[PDB]
Amino acid sequence: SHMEKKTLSLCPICLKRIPATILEEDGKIIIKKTCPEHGEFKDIYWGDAELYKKFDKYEFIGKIEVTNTKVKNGCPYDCGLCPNHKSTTILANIDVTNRCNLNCPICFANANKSGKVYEPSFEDIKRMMENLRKEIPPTPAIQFAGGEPTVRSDLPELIKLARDMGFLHVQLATNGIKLKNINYLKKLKEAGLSTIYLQFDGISEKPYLVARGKNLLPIKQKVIENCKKVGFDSVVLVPTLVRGVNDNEVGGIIRYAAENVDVVRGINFQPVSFTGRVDEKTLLEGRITIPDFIKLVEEQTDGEITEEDFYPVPSVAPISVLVEKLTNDRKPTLSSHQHCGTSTYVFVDEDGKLIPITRFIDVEGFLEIVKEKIEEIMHDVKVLGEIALKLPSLIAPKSVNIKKIIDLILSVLKSDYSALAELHYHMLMISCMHFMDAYNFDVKRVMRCCIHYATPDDRIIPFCTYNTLHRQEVEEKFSIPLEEWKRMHKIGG
Ligand SMILES: CC(C)CCC[C@@H](C)CCC[C@@H](C)CCC[C@@H](C)CCOC[C@@H](COP(=O)(O)OC[C@H](O)CO)OCC[C@H](C)CCC[C@H](C)CCC[C@H](C)CCCC(C)C
Ligand SMILES: CC(C)CCC[C@@H](C)CCC[C@@H](C)CCC[C@@H](C)CCOC[C@@H](COP(=O)(O)O)OCC[C@H](C)CCC[C@H](C)CCC[C@H](C)CCCC(C)C
Ligand SMILES: C[C@H]1O[C@@H](n2cnc3c(N)ncnc32)[C@H](O)[C@@H]1O
Ligand code: MET
Ligand code: SF4
Ligand code: SF4
Ligand code: SF4
Ligand SMILES: [Fe+3]
């Protein structure tokens, strides 16, 4: 064995803060911890030690300025955001309901299993948005979740509100069932929705039977069909990855998304996180980590995408630092922990093969130049020109006009969000974020968390502490018993 780090974790029994050791063992990264009352625990932290060490070099420590709570009990008990948090809200979640038209066996929110209805008012949601916009820099992206947001009749008005509040990106996490109605999808599109974060467990029926309790695959494909018909070209497929259920369909999901790249902008795989409601078989067997996913991509894409093509999230953090000094304005920085997730971008050519952007562009060299020019940054245009002149030396699909890609990359360096958006329409994002549970919790990771829930009590809580420590507290305070809520609201709320 070989000790890598010391950190703090949580006891899976009593959720107490306990010491933890991260160590290399048989080519894998495991985490060991000891609760003074419940003994010692062991879990797989990362399935590949070599990729763990490689990602460790992209560490980036951010900074916050606007807080909502104070230091009282220490991390992870002071969410949030307390003075010791190291990242501002990049993507915010607002749970608009705990009601749902499904009853999935796997659900980190554990919806419908409380006998109480949590549905913040339009005015509560606007106040939560104001808290998010008060940050420095203001939160640029917001996602409605739950729960199933489409069971609220005012969801189009909520989407319009997010646009009126200044959010550049408005996202909808949904099972997509109500989106089989093409007129409703039109209402969401006209309301200003940016992206549909679509639950999508596989390309065959069995993953939906195991994870959702029924075959939703025809409904999923109908949603994709309706998105083509109305021109909604920003869909992200979200497979909950479970070993023994859909780890064999990683390539199939990618290939199906590539066939529909006109509407599908990405696939964000989510390894099953043992929070909320998990069936006893998935809880015991289906533990999979980020490098295990990277291995599945390389195996099930026949080498088209390799482990060299995947980068951690904070690798692009210096890009925001460069634009920040280039414009003298605070920019949202992807300062999450290097072991929270990974991503790559691929182009789809004529035959259908997948060319990662790392295949024909020296991304590691581009980031190297960006880091070099941060110290040096009339001279700023020369720096941009030097970058513009050094970009051809770091460069491929024939159907890709590489000259417009260069212009969009350089425009992104000028805080041009519309260039960032247009650049994503040329590519297919393949990513994976592994949310922590009580078994693999790492305080050093969650301190840099960039994905936060806005709560009705004026707090902003990192995703991984909210779903392990805070969700029941918050929802119970602001919920109404089901029997009384039904008798005071219509089916739409
Ligand atoms: C270069 C490589 C080596 C990799 C480098 C590192 C890599 C980590 C960098 C990643 C950067 C990336 C996240 C940046 C995304 C920017 C992008 C969203 C900007 C907008 O990009 C354009 C959007 C569409 O937006 P519009 O054009 O405004 O609206 C069009 C509208 O439909 C009009 O009808 O499509 C595009 C849609 C996007 C693709 C959507 C991305 C969504 C995220 C993946 C969502 C992540 C969610 C979290 C895991 C939280 C989940 C919470 C849940 C569990 C409740
Ligand atoms: C060029 C090639 C070779 C390499 C890089 C490829 C490229 C596609 C990567 C892009 C990475 C970006 C972070 C870079 C953007 C850089 C910014 C400085 C651009 C600034 O312009 C947009 C600013 C808004 O600024 P103002 O409000 O002041 O006008 O951020 C507003 C935009 C922000 C970024 C909103 C982001 C929205 C999404 C939904 C947030 C997701 C958050 C997750 C933590 C990330 C996903 C993680 C994976 C593992 C799922
Ligand atoms: C918001 C997205 O999260 C997915 N999802 C639901 N439960 C879990 C879990 N335990 N782990 C990971 N992802 C999950 C949903 O299927 C939806 O697509
Ligand atoms: C707990 S998941 C909440 C979002 C939505 N119900 C989905 O499954 O995609
Ligand atoms: S996760 Fe962040 S906000 Fe929450 S207690 Fe830790 S440092 Fe503070
Ligand atoms: S995972 Fe989503 S769709 Fe399934 S029960 Fe939970 S909230 Fe509803
Ligand atoms: S939500 Fe969890 S996995 Fe994602 S950045 Fe925050 S702490 Fe890391
Ligand atoms: Fe304990």
Explain this structure to me?
- It is classed as oxidoreductase.
- Keywords: Radical SAM Enzyme, Biphytanyl Chain, Glycerol dibiphytanyl glycerol tetraether, Archaeal Lipid modification, [4Fe-4S] cluster, Rubredoxin, oxidoreductase.
- The assembly is monomeric.
- X-ray crystal structure of glycerol dibiphytanyl glycerol tetraether - macrocyclic archaeol synthase (GDGT-MAS) from Methanocaldococcus jannaschii with archaeal lipid, 5'deoxyadenosine, and methionine bound.
- The protein: glycerol dibiphytanyl glycerol tetraether - macrocyclic archaeol synthase.
- By secondary structure, the protein is of the alpha/beta class.
- It has 2 domains: about 1-45; about 90-435, Aldolase class I (TIM Barrel), CATH 3.20.20.
- Helices cover about 35% and strands about 20% of the residues.
- It has helices at about 50-55, 120-135, 155-165, 180-190, 205-210, 215-230, 250-260, 280-285, 290-300, 315-325, 355-360, 365-375, 380-390, 400-410, 415-425, 445, 465-475, 480-485; strands at about 1-10, 15-25, 30-35, 40-45, 90-95, 115, 140-145, 170-175, 195-200, 235-240, 240, 265-270, 310, 340-350, 355, 430-435, 450-455, 460, 480.
- The strands form 3 sheets. Strands 5, 7, 8, 9, 10, 11, 12, 13, 14, 15, 16, 17 and 18 form a 13-stranded mixed beta sheet that branches.
- β11 (about 240), α7 and β12 (about 265-270) form a beta-alpha-beta unit.
- α14 packs antiparallel against α15 (about 415-425).
- The chain is globular, with a radius of gyration of 22 Å.
- It binds 3-[glycerolylphosphonyl]-[1,2-di-phytanyl]glycerol, 3-phosphoryl-[1,2-di-phytanyl]glycerol, 5'-deoxyadenosine, methionine, iron/sulfur cluster (3 copies) and fe (iii) ion (FE).
- One iron/sulfur cluster (SF4) binds near residues 75, 76, 79, 82 and 84.
- The site of one iron/sulfur cluster has 14 residues, from α16 and α17.
